[PDB]
Design a protein around this motif. Sequence first.
Motif, short mmCIF file in Angstrom:
data_model
loop_
_atom_site.label_atom_id
_atom_site.label_comp_id
_atom_site.label_asym_id
_atom_site.label_seq_id
_atom_site.Cartn_x
_atom_site.Cartn_y
_atom_site.Cartn_z
N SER A 79 7.26 16.32 -27.07
CA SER A 79 6.43 16.98 -28.07
C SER A 79 6.00 16.01 -29.14
O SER A 79 6.77 15.15 -29.56
N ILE B 70 7.24 23.88 -24.78
CA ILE B 70 7.01 22.49 -24.97
C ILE B 70 5.52 22.17 -24.82
O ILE B 70 5.02 21.31 -25.53
N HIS C 9 2.90 21.79 -27.74
CA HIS C 9 3.02 20.66 -28.61
C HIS C 9 2.96 19.37 -27.80
O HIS C 9 3.57 18.35 -28.19
N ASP C 10 2.24 19.40 -26.67
CA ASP C 10 2.01 18.20 -25.86
C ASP C 10 0.54 18.12 -25.43
O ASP C 10 0.01 19.07 -24.83
#
Lengths: 322, 322
Positions: B168, B230, B233-234
Amino acid sequence: SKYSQDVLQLLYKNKPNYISGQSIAESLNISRTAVKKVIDQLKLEGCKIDSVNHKGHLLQQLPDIWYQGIIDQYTKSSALFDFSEVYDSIDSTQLAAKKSLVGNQSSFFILSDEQTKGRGRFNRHWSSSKGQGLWMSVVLRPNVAFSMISKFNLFIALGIRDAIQHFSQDEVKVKWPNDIYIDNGKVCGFLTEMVANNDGIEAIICGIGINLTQQLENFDESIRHRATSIQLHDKNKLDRYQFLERLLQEIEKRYNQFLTLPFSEIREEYIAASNIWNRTLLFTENDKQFKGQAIDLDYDGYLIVRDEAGESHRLISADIDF
Amino acid sequence: SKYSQDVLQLLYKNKPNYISGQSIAESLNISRTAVKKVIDQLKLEGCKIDSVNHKGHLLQQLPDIWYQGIIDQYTKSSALFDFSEVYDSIDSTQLAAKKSLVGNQSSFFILSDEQTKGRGRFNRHWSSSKGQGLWMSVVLRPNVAFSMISKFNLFIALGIRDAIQHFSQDEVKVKWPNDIYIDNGKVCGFLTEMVANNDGIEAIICGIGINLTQQLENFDESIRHRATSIQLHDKNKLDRYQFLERLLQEIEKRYNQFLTLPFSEIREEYIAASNIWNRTLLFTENDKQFKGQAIDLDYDGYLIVRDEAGESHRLISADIDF
Ligand SMILES: CC1(C)O[C@@H]2[C@H](O1)[C@@H](Cn1cc(CCCCC[C@@H]3SC[C@@H]4NC(=O)N[C@@H]43)nn1)O[C@H]2n1cnc2c(N)ncnc21
Ligand SMILES: CC1(C)O[C@@H]2[C@H](O1)[C@@H](Cn1cc(CCCCC[C@@H]3SC[C@@H]4NC(=O)N[C@@H]43)nn1)O[C@H]2n1cnc2c(N)ncnc21
């Protein structure tokens, strides 16, 4: 047959009166002549059932075999235990209990006439002969922190000791924290394990092995000099069912005290029942071994040991030989 | 088919080169045209495999499905883990692990794409959507006293946090003692349980749920405002296998530190990763609830809380809302 257990159960339920073949036949809605054959079968297995014309059948004495049908009666009339599982032979009642407890909150026990892979502490071999002792695992569901396991293990000790006592003419003693002795003979081993997390105990599994009817002749030769059966200290035939009844009663009693008393309350009693005082004890801890004396059990169940070198230890557990 | 996994495994083993249908066909001693059909099947399932004439096949990208064949490769090359079990859907990986651990000393993990009866602490519901997160249970075999469970649970926290972090862009934080957050979103719940007795731990079962690919849209509406995946935030596609690889690596790392360090060594780090400071925390304990501040984590993993009434508490565990 399919109905052996059902018949047995009916026989047990109806004691001290007789019930007729007819009557059982109607209960199970099977034929009279099937009942006669199932009864002949039970007699063969070693049930002592008196059969009188017109009157019917009276179960007089069960053999040294656990029957689910009869144990079903012990769980039906019990507050603590939801069910039991009964086996003639299994790897270990402890493995079975650890498996059966997953995914539920039942309280239950498992009995088996023999164990092929009976284990005690540190995965040590526990001898479980067909027909000769009570090999049981008890799963209970105390709503308590995981550090209370030790305390469980002390209360239960006294439960087991009281149950064996009622049946032996000789003096029965607890060997902290996991054994029950009659003079020099280990008559019972027990082992209390838990499934738990930070928030508390998911289950207590207490495995309990008690020798009931071995003659010394029956014990593997390495253990013969330090083992014993309840029989060898009882003038009367030891009836496994009669004993199982007392055992469940005391387990329940001590479980309730476990739930409601701190250790201090039974400490004195535990003391006066222990057999580890005034004698040299051998301790194992991993590699090391050392001798020591048991000075005291503190109000929290820890053994206070003064070792051979003069140093004091406070232990929650140990394996002690004599 | 019977050979799907075997083919996949071969594909994975042979990366970054291509292998021919012929070659797989000989490996498994099955027909070429069976291979072509098994490959068509994998492509259909969402495997991205490039196929070139004369050259053969190259596994380029796996879908959001766990394949035992590939996970078998992760256990083969791992020191910690003896095997894994992989499922498309199961009641709970935690129930499965508690069952599979009985009677052996294996270390293993269980992955399942979905859980129908996923539970967290206090038997609270844990949402385990097909295809969207890593729902795993890890069984390890630390030779240590049962009171070390808490310590386990702190080390592992940091393992999980480091693994999520690597993926992240945003800041990842531990919510003592059992949650991992990305800003306001719970991105992972974990729960460390044990089977143990007075003499020590028989097994650690750590269940770990990590949201990988949900869009807020995908979270049940009650949790939407405090959950996160996850993915969210990637910038890049999140590859579950690539992540699983990092996760196992960090689990192992922290497990070794668990075995060899006291808590004091990671305390500062745990601190600087925690997100429970300078803010009002809500605590549940049975019936009661009260507010409080986290003052400090002592050198032994206990939270030091000064409650709203001014009283200090030292806790080994708690459930905290924000
Ligand atoms: C050399 C010596 C002294 O001889 C052996 C051995 O060391 C020692 C090893 N050990 C570990 C523990 C802890 C208590 C175990 C509880 C067993 C119950 S059965 C239902 C449940 N299912 C299950 O799998 N386990 C539980 N006790 N003993 O015991 C002696 N020993 C072995 N068998 C017997 C026996 N039948 N009677 C007396 N002593 C015995
Ligand atoms: C009202 C609120 C805040 O919303 C819910 C609920 O309260 C709270 C309840 N709880 C107890 C625990 C402890 C950790 C559990 C580990 C699960 C892993 S999965 C592999 C393994 N198999 C298994 O059965 N368990 C483990 N965590 N959460 O979580 C929120 N919640 C539920 N699902 C999710 C989710 N998917 N993502 C974020 N938050 C969630």
